[PDB]
């Protein structure tokens, strides 16, 4: 009933430490110019603007705006019975 909530806190916490800052965000941007550069124009488009949303956030949220263990609940891996 709580096997994989702290297999997930665990990994997704001390992953979080290295991850914290191991990683910038100057290969980020620059990869999705790499990989979302193949991407056909129009989800091109809408994949370069959500960067922009998901650029400087995503890299920053899960590890303060977020906590690493609350993830694990966004993610809903405890799902106890099937997602409503």
Request: aromatic letters at 4%; glycine letters at 2%; a negative charge.
């Amino acid at each position: 009933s709580d096997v994989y909530c702290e297999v997930c806190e665990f990994l997704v916490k001390e992953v979080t430490k290295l991850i914290d800052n191991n990683k910038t965000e100057k290969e980020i941007l620059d990869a999705f110019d790499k990989m979302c550069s193949k991407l056909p124009k129009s989800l091109s488009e809408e994949c370069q603007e959500v960067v922009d949303t998901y650029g400087s956030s995503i890299l920053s949220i899960l590890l303060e705006e977020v906590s690493p263990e609350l993830v694990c609940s966004m993610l809903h891996l405890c799902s106890g019975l099937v997602p409503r």
